[PDB]
Amino acid sequence: KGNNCLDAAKACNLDDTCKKYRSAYITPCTTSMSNEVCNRRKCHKALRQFFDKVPAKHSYGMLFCSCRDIACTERRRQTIVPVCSYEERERPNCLSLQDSCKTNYICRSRLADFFTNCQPESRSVSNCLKENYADCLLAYSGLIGTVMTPNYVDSSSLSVAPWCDCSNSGNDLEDCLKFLNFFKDNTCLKNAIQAFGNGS
Amino acid sequence: KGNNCLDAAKACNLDDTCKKYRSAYITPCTTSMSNEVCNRRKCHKALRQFFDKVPAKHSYGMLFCSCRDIACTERRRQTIVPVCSYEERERPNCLSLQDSCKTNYICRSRLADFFTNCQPESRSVSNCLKENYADCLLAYSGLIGTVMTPNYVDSSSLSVAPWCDCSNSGNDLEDCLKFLNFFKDNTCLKNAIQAFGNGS
Amino acid sequence: QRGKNRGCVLTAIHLNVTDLGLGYETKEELIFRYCSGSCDAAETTYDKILKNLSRNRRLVSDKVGQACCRPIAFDDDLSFLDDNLVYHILRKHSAKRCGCI
Amino acid sequence: QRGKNRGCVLTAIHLNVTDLGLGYETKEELIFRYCSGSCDAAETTYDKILKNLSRNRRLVSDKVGQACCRPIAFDDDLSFLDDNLVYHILRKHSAKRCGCI
Numbered sequence: 001k002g003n004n005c006l007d008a009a010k011a012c013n014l015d016d017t018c019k020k021y022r023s024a025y026i027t028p029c030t031t032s033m034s035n036e037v038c039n040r041r042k043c044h045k046a047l048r049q050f051f052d053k054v055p056a057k058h059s060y061g062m063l064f065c066s067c068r069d070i071a072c073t074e075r076r077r078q079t080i081v082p083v084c085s086y087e088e089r090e091r092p093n094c095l096s097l098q099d100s101c102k103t104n105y106i107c108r109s110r111l112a113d114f115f116t117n118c119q120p121e122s123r124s125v126s127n128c129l130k131e132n133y134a135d136c137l138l139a140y141s142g143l144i145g146t147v148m149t150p151n152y153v154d155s156s157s158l159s160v161a162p163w164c165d166c167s168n169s170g171n172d173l174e175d176c177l178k179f180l181n182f183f184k185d186n187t188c189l190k191n192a193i194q195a196f197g198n199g200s
Numbered sequence: 201k202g203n204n205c206l207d208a209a210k211a212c213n214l215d216d217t218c219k220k221y222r223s224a225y226i227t228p229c230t231t232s233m234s235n236e237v238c239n240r241r242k243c244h245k246a247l248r249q250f251f252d253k254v255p256a257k258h259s260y261g262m263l264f265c266s267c268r269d270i271a272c273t274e275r276r277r278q279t280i281v282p283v284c285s286y287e288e289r290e291r292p293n294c295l296s297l298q299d300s301c302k303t304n305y306i307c308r309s310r311l312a313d314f315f316t317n318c319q320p321e322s323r324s325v326s327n328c329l330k331e332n333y334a335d336c337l338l339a340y341s342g343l344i345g346t347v348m349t350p351n352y353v354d355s356s357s358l359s360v361a362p363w364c365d366c367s368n369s370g371n372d373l374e375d376c377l378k379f380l381n382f383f384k385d386n387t388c389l390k391n392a393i394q395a396f397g398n399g400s
Numbered sequence: 401q402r403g404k405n406r407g408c409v410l411t412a413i414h415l416n417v418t419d420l421g422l423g424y425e426t427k428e429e430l431i432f433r434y435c436s437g438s439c440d441a442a443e444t445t446y447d448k449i450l451k452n453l454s455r456n457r458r459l460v461s462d463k464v465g466q467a468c469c470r471p472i473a474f475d476d477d478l479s480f481l482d483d484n485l486v487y488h489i490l491r492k493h494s495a496k497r498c499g500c501i
Numbered sequence: 502q503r504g505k506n507r508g509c510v511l512t513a514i515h516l517n518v519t520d521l522g523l524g525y526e527t528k529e530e531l532i533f534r535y536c537s538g539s540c541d542a543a544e545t546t547y548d549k550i551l552k553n554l555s556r557n558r559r560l561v562s563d564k565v566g567q568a569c570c571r572p573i574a575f576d577d578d579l580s581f582l583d584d585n586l587v588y589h590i591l592r593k594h595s596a597k598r599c600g601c602i
């Protein structure tokens with residue numbers, strides 16, 4: 001058989017634009033430095049350029065492809081090159097990470113679009129307050145290459161989170177968890193990704 | 201048959217050094233500028249480098265080859281590319297030309313070697329005061345690429361002169377003619393050139 | 401004048417990366433493009449000399465040292481994820497433009 | 502490893518300038534040097550791909566788009582005086598080093 005993620009890699013490599021901008025990010029994201037696995041800034045940059053410059057039909061195919069097995073979900077999880085772009089020795093606190101994000105024009109803007117566009121509403125048919133999967137996917141993919149870079153965490157599901165947790169939150173733990181769970185347990189986002197994977 | 205000047209052109213083009221430095225001077229000497237036949241300075245430079253950098257056996261072969269016909273003597277006369285390196289619209293006075301020469305280190309030095317080394321003495325077997333054809337030829341070829349650049353004038357003989365005459369010399373006419381005739385009627389130089397052409 | 405050596409052209413083929421025999425183990429794919437066709441017409445001084453020397457028989461042979469149809473520009477880099485989830489990048493593997501050289 | 506394509510070599514011939522057929526009328530002479538020999542061994546990614554695709558039959562043919570033995574450097578300029586006492590200079594007319602390209 002193969003899988004939908006392979007098919008999306010095939011389509012990308014057969015398209016002049018997708019192919020070029022994929023290589024443009026795979027390069028800095030896998031080129032190790034002295035005493036570091038990659039240059040995270042240059043990898044982040046190329047990731048942003050990938051999603052900004054490559055039409056959604058190609059760039060989303062690889063990020064949001066639907067899977068039936070672990071060979072597929074593991075390919076999908078590697079799309080953003082997480083060893084370089086996502087993981088770090090330690091997880092910062094999500095409220096500190098949000099603060100860092102907000103000092104940066106692109107991060108602040110993409111983060112706000114995310115909370116605005118992927119707001120779940122349980123009373124809606126789409127399950128999204130703004131009722132627009134396209135704007136939620138745009139907002140989510142938009143975070144990739146910011147300090148708020150998110151990725152799939154749970155290989156049996158579509159669950160995502162940035163690289164942060166809520167350890168040592170003091171009085172702000174409830175706010176922290178609200179922020180973190182907006183990524184982890186987000187019916188609007190999950191439906192939007194499922195919708196893209198179906199072929200809407 | 202052909203001629204000795206052709207043979208010397210053949211030898212030169214078959215030698216790495218002579219070939220390269222010949223082209224190095226033919227180029228600037230035949231490349232016309234806006235409103236001028238060549239850049240005389242650049243042609244002069246390359247001529248000096250030709251005689252300084254190419255061994256005498258090659259560089260002299262072309263300059264001093266012996267001829268039996270006008271096809272040979274005309275080839276020999278073109279060796280220094282005289283249209284560029286020798287001729288000018290007007291002939292200056294040889295005493296003015298000597299003055300200009302003397303303000304230049306290379307010209308002053310080469311000119312003195314010439315008068316020293318090609319001094320004719322009628323009582324000698326060689327007909328040279330310094331009795332050394334090699335030093336006279338060295339001194340003469342040495343002037344090529346200076347303002348005192350000499351060339352064959354008289355296609356039926358080995359007679360040479362720089363590009364100057366003795367018109368308007370006032371009281372200095374005798375000195376002027378002495379200078380000019382040292383090139384034109386020089387038994388030491390003529391013997392030295394004949395000697396090279398024979399194969400000494 | 402209307403273009404010497406018009407027959408030197410680009411051809412595209414659809415391949416698995418494994419078909420390239422470059423040591424990779426992966427299910428990923430590419431378009432590979434190559435340059436082929438004749439370069440009989442001389443486009444340089446050197447090539448004119450070779451052609452003229454065969455014509456006048458100073459070179460006892462024909463087509464010796466001739467130019468050939470070769471890439472003069474390459475397609476962009478191609479990357480892929482292999483079976484062990486390792487990324488690779490192919491460079492200068494596919495032709496973008498052809499010429500006689 | 503001990504040098505692929507060792508057979509791609511320089512050869513020198515002694516010529517009249519008129520033998521070149523370049524339009525000149527002159528009694529002058531030159532050494533003309535050219536590059537010839539086989540380029541069967543692949544020295545680049547692109548060439549490895551071509552060779553591998555013939556081997557595994559994805560290219561229904563052999564030796565298509567192959568490299569050839571060509572100058573990778575040229576001898577110095579050659580000048581001469583023609584029959585009408587006009588000077589000329591030949592450039593990039595003779596090879597100094599050969600390679601498969």
Ligand SMILES: O=S(=O)(O)OC[C@H]1O[C@@](COS(=O)(=O)O)(O[C@H]2O[C@H](COS(=O)(=O)O)[C@@H](OS(=O)(=O)O)[C@H](OS(=O)(=O)O)[C@H]2OS(=O)(=O)O)[C@@H](OS(=O)(=O)O)[C@@H]1OS(=O)(=O)O
Pocket residue numbers: 041045048049104105106107
């Ligand atoms: O126009 S935007 O404000 O929307 O910003 C995006 C464009 O600016 C670039 C230009 O890069 S370039 O094409 O390589 O010259 O990036 C530059 O600005 C961003 C954002 O800065 S900002 O203060 O938030 O506005 C910087 O990224 S980041 O530090 O915020 O993460 C770039 O820094 S870096 O190179 O990634 O370190 C900065 O690049 S540069 O210093 O000018 O070279 C492009 O964005 S980017 O490719 O995502 O970095 C955008 O240009 S574009 O023409 O729209 O593609």
Ligand SMILES: O=S(=O)(O)OC[C@H]1O[C@@](COS(=O)(=O)O)(O[C@H]2O[C@H](COS(=O)(=O)O)[C@@H](OS(=O)(=O)O)[C@H](OS(=O)(=O)O)[C@H]2OS(=O)(=O)O)[C@@H](OS(=O)(=O)O)[C@@H]1OS(=O)(=O)O
Pocket residue numbers: 241245248249304305306307
């Ligand atoms: O060492 S010497 O005093 O004997 O002079 C000869 C060397 O100097 C050169 C260097 O040129 S370069 O190799 O291209 O760099 O020429 C330079 O000096 C001469 C003589 O000047 S001087 O004041 O009389 O000593 C200049 O010639 S001239 O103006 O007197 O006719 C050169 O000027 S020009 O380029 O011909 O206009 C001057 O060149 S430069 O400005 O330094 O570039 C070489 O002499 S040359 O090739 O005959 O000009 C000699 O260098 S070498 O390493 O011995 O070959």
